[PDB]
Design a protein around this ligand. Structure first.
Ligand code: SAM
Ligand code: SAM
Lengths: 385, 385
């Protein structure tokens, strides 16, 4: 009744990654491709089962494993995946990531939860092709009031997929009211499409708020909608938020107005802005985009980070705290440490490593997917003898 | 009149380390040593000031910098160092590390505080030579009821120093009552390990206790006096503590009895004991001793850890937590990840990295002194799809 099962044969000796729960197979690791595009079973050289997933040569990864046990990629399968995801996020409040792609056994799907509204992103050909199957499953398990789709245009384009933005189900407000620990950020959907909201900094934002003392001065660089700055203000500190996105600063402005809190705002670029500040500030926070495409780009990126951190440290009060985050898998903690050491040497400052943090639980770091870890943060305190 | 300032000259280009707050200068890095042994000033090839410290060719490190600004290593200097150290530990409770060597600007000195009793160790010739100077300063600033000295016998010998164990000030009880979060461990000081107690695990113990649910089973391996095990018991879990030190397990028994808590105990070695257990356990904690004392020993110790972690994972219940600590500078997070991946692959288990932690604030990690960081912990959760 059906066409023959699509079956992929993995090169001998390259099946170990799949057996060890790494979901991606590239072209050179496939001994024999399936006789078409779609849901496929992967087997080893001796024909033993390895995975069921999606085969499509047009995808950046030709085979992405969806499951590591036999079975279909049907409605019930997706129901179980979303049920697992939901359970993993129990007690994580109302604003959190629900689905973090392959780490949640759902390659190419990101789902963020803001109260009763979901915002999702589809990043791979397999997940796009299975949309008619998994979406009803998602709606059934979560039962949201509405679902919005945003697009990583370049990610879609690299997968040969069209951009896709809009309400996919139910009702989504024109202004998404993102709530985090009593703070409400009114984010217009246009901004939600372009950027979104950085749920991955939630635990850093909580740690930061507990450290702020009334009367202190805070510099929140790459602030976006000002999660850090607003918390500083709530604690009685003076905060200056810096971002090049005027739309994002507009949200921070409104969010601060709602609470009768005063936050200073600078619309401008991080490095030029910091070069024009005198300081000092008791906390300086840096959350730069650190786009690294190739490893050879790393020394140049680290030199730029040194320029930024040198200004940040110059602006740092005695015994103050400097927060340096990187959201690239290619930029390791060791690289951040090197950057900090170079900047400190330029200024003759002595620093202590106060905390090192990694992305929170709703953005799972899988042991088996080395690139699962992308966000890490180095918190330094000025430590004079 | 005094003799000329003892003056050491650093080889051209090797002075950057000292300028950047790394205190150790090695034989191959010294162009011209001072006249004799004792308090010496280090200057660069151009004669500019670098540091004041202690020069002694008998020490592992011929020159250790005590201060990076001009001045004597007198009583007032040490008073200032202990005052700084004391202030850094405000709000860290009544028990904590007070002085963590070089990271606290006091090379070769460790001071732990247990209420009104200090336990210290002196690890290099400089500190030993200056004890008539710094001990009264320590007593003046901290005003303890008693001070006990233990020796890292091996380290002392490396410095050409004798064993020193005993009371060096005031009154120290035969049995040191170490208090931590409502737990009281009666530790006989004579048969105690190191300073008596592992204060470096305090934050991990707190994190762990918050995760234990009643009825769960806990396996606490390398338990020492049972800080983890006892916390499990108080939360209503069944705990089995494993350690090869019968004296330490005796302390655990007394601590548990005082609180009316039941903890199971196995006197035995970790790997043999785990090989004979069936399990499963909801939490498995592995806190091995240093293990890797020299870099050459790393591969053999990683093979041992793979064996240990394989058994621990086999013993881990579905969705259970596995804690793996390393307290050696030579054994890094990346090594722990590698060990975990190998063990998980052997068993066909899928794990998530739940938390990575580093040593607490009272054991400062100086950006400028890599070896000030020795403890890091990988916490994994079983993560089936
Ligand atoms: C990863 S987000 C920071 C998130 C923020 N820390 C939070 O807690 O929500 C990076 C931000 O940097 C801004 N940005 C990118 N390049 C910039 C630059 N050169 N100068 C200032 N802001 C920049 C973007 O607008 C974006 O809001
Ligand atoms: C770093 S301490 C563990 C401290 C403990 N986890 C705590 O929180 O206090 C290492 C412990 O390992 C024990 N030990 C050393 N080798 C062992 C072995 N082969 N088997 C079992 N215990 C061992 C020592 O007696 C010591 O108590």
């Amino acid at each position: 009744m059906l066409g023959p099962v699509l079956r992929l044969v993995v090169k001998a000796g390259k099946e170990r990654k799949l057996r060890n729960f790494y979901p991606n197979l590239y072209r050179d690791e496939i001994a024999a491709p399936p006789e078409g595009v779609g849901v496929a079973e992967a087997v080893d050289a001796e024909g033993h089962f390895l995975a069921v997933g999606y085969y499509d040569p047009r995808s950046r990864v030709p085979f992405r494993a969806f499951r590591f046990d036999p079975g279909p990629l049907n409605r019930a399968f997706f129901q179980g995946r979303f049920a697992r995801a939901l359970r993993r996020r129990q007690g994580l409040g109302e604003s959190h990531r629900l689905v973090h792609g392959e780490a949640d056994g759902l390659p190419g799907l990101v789902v963020d939860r803001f109260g009763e509204v979901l915002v999702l992103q589809v990043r791979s050909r397999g997940m796009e092709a299975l949309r008619e199957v998994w979406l009803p499953a998602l709606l059934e398990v979560v039962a949201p009031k509405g679902v919005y789709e945003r697009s990583d245009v370049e990610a879609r384009r690299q997968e040969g997929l069209p951009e896709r933005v809009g309400v996919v189900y139910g009702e989504v407000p024109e202004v998404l009211e993102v709530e985090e620990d009593g703070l409400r950020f009114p984010i217009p959907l246009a901004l939600a499409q372009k950027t979104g909201y950085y749920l991955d900094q939630r635990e850093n934002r909580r740690l930061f708020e507990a450290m702020v003392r009334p009367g202190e001065r805070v510099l929140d660089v790459y602030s976006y909608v000002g999660g850090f700055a607003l918390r500083a203000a709530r604690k009685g500190a003076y905060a200056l938020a810096v971002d090049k996105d005027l739309e994002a600063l507009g949200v921070l402005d409104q969010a601060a107005l709602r609470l009768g809190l005063r936050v200073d705002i600078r619309h401008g670029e991080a490095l030029p802005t910091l070069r024009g500040l005198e300081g000092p500030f008791h906390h300086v926070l840096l959350d730069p985009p650190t786009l690294v495409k190739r490893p050879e780009e790393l020394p140049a990126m680290k030199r730029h980070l040194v320029d930024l951190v040198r200004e940040a440290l110059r602006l740092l009060a005695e015994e103050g705290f400097l927060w340096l985050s990187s959201c690239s898998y290619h930029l390791r903690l060791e690289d951040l440490l090197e950057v900090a050491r170079r900047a400190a040497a330029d200024l003759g400052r002595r620093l202590r490593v106060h905390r090192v943090t990694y992305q929170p639980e709703d953005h799972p770091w899988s042991l088996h997917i080395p690139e699962s870890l992308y966000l890490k943060t180095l918190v330094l305190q000025d430590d004079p003898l």
